[PDB]
């Protein structure tokens, strides 16, 4: 029975699964070289 508080409740997905980056470092000058790292763990 759709009441006032229950009207916006959409039904759950059929297979019960729900729709859900990596680190980027800057090794700066702190020879000399800067390193932008897309690291993944």
């Amino acid at each position: 029975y759709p009441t006032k508080e229950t009207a916006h409740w959409k039904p759950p997905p059929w297979n019960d699964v729900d729709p859900p980056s990596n680190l980027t470092l800057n090794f700066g000058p702190q020879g000399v070289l800067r390193l932008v790292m897309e690291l993944s763990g």
Binding site: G28, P29, Q30, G31, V32
Partner: protein, 156 residues
């Protein structure tokens, strides 16, 4: 008087402790880093003066600008200088850090690191020999020795 004597002896104490325990953050910019490495090498051996080898920038006492300061890295130089606790000091090593050197008229070179940071000791040479860099370090220690911090505090 008495308090003048006390602040003079405590000035001697803190100046002794600061000059005999200088920890350098060496910018390895260019060829002068090689001669700094020879100044840390066994023959000249900075470590026996209390001058440790490759201290971290957030505890170091003296910044040695050893090599060519270019325009792409001058903000990084001023950033590492601003991250140094006081009393911080700057030793400029070699001609490109002193006044631009062999790349003075270049489009990309800071003409002296004293356009960026306040510089205490200018070490001349291309590169200065490691013995001469060590001379500049000992002249910095003698400059720290004649500081008058608590004397000027007691007189102001």
């Amino acid at each position: 008087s008495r308090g003048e004597y006390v602040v003079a002896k405590l000035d001697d104490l803190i100046n002794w402790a600061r000059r005999s325990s200088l920890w350098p953050m060496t910018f390895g910019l260019a060829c002068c880093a090689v001669e700094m490495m020879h100044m840390a090498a066994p023959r000249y051996d900075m470590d026996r003066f209390g001058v440790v080898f490759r201290a971290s920038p957030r505890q170091s006492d003296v910044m040695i600008v050893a090599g060519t300061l270019t325009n792409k890295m001058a903000p990084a130089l001023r950033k590492v200088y601003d991250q140094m606790p006081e009393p911080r000091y700057v030793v400029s090593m070699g001609s490109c850090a002193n006044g631009g050197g062999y790349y003075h008229y270049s489009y990309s070179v800071v003409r002296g690191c004293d356009r960026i940071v306040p510089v205490d000791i200018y070490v001349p040479g291309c590169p200065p020999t490691a013995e001469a860099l060590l001379y500049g370090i000992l002249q910095l220690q003698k400059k720290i020795k004649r500081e008058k911090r608590l004397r000027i505090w007691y007189r102001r």
